Structure 1
Amino acid sequence: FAKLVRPPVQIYGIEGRYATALYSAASKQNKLEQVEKELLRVGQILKEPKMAASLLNPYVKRSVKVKSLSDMTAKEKFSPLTSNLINLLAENGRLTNTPAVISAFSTMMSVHRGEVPCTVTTASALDETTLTELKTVLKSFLSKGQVLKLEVKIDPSIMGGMIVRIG
């Protein structure tokens, strides 16, 4: 057994169970950002076909997938151990899943713990702070060109039906 690091995000299983591993891995040593970043970099460095979807053939087998993606951490220069967990997604086919696993991981720094608004809100963007919708108040109360095709129009809708909804 081990220390179990459940930092906000956390995929709540669902194949960032590695992420949860790695949240405790990351957290151990706090190579948090490094690896967080490793992962970004990696992220498309992999995710493009470029040797990578070729290597994401099934048909190439971990005979040497273990010897070329893995040895793409070798092929790359990342891997402070970040390949090793690759080599696991490697069997565990999670490579195709990874962005999201990274997402969950990241989000970014304190960004690790974001938030985007909704109900009557129009607004897109994360929240890194403690108490909030101070900032959101001051986020709206920033610009005023603004959208409502970036979220809620309270307009068609909220109460646009309601009177109707009474009759």
Structure 2
Amino acid sequence: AKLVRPPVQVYGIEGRYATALYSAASKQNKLEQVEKELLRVAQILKEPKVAASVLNPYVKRSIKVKSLNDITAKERFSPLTTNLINLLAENGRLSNTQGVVSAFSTMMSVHRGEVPCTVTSASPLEEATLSELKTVLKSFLSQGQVLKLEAKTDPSILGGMIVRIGEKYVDMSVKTKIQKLGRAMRE
């Protein structure tokens, strides 16, 4: 049977299950719907009681899938996500579903056209020039694209900026310029 592969490809059991889910949703156009669904599922699981109920390797698979089918019939979840959690309970890959959730997120994160930018500076960033750099980084993209800019600071880089657009990488920091000038005067 033909499969619809997402624009980003994730690997591991996490990637395989999330790819299966995406290629199932793309045939019926319920992508953000099942995104909402798995968001609710992940926040359901992250509570400690049911988590230890499903993380226990002593609970027999029928018992834990019983609790899971009960709780998913509780929240009137779509048959797609109920089937997915049923498969995670069948194959015993259930404890890892969080990653799958995260995986699917990142997958749809490139479905809406977002690119993650990470800006490191030696100083906590200002507001004006931060918006300026946001505008500058937007010019490196195609239309229909969004910037997920998250600027954390490293006060050890001695200045400048280190910008990471996807995996493209520009090192405008001053410590690297110092190292390069030292290498130049040495060789």
* Fold match by TM threshold 0.5: yes
Partners of 1:32 and 1:96 in 2: CA distance: 23
- Deviation of residue 54 (structure 1)? 1.6
CA separation of 1:109 and 1:6: change in aligned 2, threshold 3 A = closer
How many matched pairs?
A: 153
**Aligned residue in 2 for 1:29:** 28
- Deviation of residue 88 (structure 1)? 1.1
Which amino acid in 1 is paired with 2:89? Answer: A
TM-score, scaled to structure 1: 0.72
Are the aligned partners of 2:54 and 2:64 in contact in 1 as well (CA < 8 Å)?
A: yes
**Aligned residue in 1 for 2:96:** 97
Q: Give me the CA root mean square deviation.
A: 3.4
**Aligned residue in 1 for 2:168:** none
Structure 2 residues without counterparts, runs of 5 or longer = 121-129, 156-160, 163-170
Partners of 1:156 and 1:91 in 2: CA distance: 54
Q: Tell me if 1:9 matches 2:8.
A: yes
Q: Tell me if 1:117 matches 2:117.
A: yes
Per the alignment, in what secondary structure is the counterpart of residue 117 of structure 1? strand
Partners of 1:47 and 1:135 in 2: CA distance: 29
- Deviation of residue 7 (structure 1)? 0.9
Partners of 1:108 and 1:21 in 2: CA distance: 12
Structure 1 residues without counterparts, runs of 5 or longer = 140-145
TM-score, scaled to structure 2: 0.66
Q: How does 1:1-167 map to 2 (within 5 A)?
A: 2-107=1-106, 111-112=110-111, 113-117=113-117, 121-122=119-120, 131=142, 148-149=153-154, 152=162, 154-166=172-184, 167=186
Between Structure 1 and Structure 2, which shows a larger proportion of strand residues?
A: 2
Partners of 1:67 and 1:135 in 2: CA distance: 42
Between Structure 1 and Structure 2, whose CA radius of gyration is higher? 2
Are the aligned partners of 2:114 and 2:146 in contact in 1 as well (CA < 8 Å)?
A: no
Partners of 2:18 and 2:108 in 1: CA distance: 16
Are the aligned partners of 1:19 and 1:101 in contact in 2 as well (CA < 8 Å)?
A: yes
- Deviation of residue 25 (structure 1)? 0.6
Between Structure 1 and Structure 2, which shows a larger proportion of helix residues?
A: 2
Identity of aligned residues (%): 66
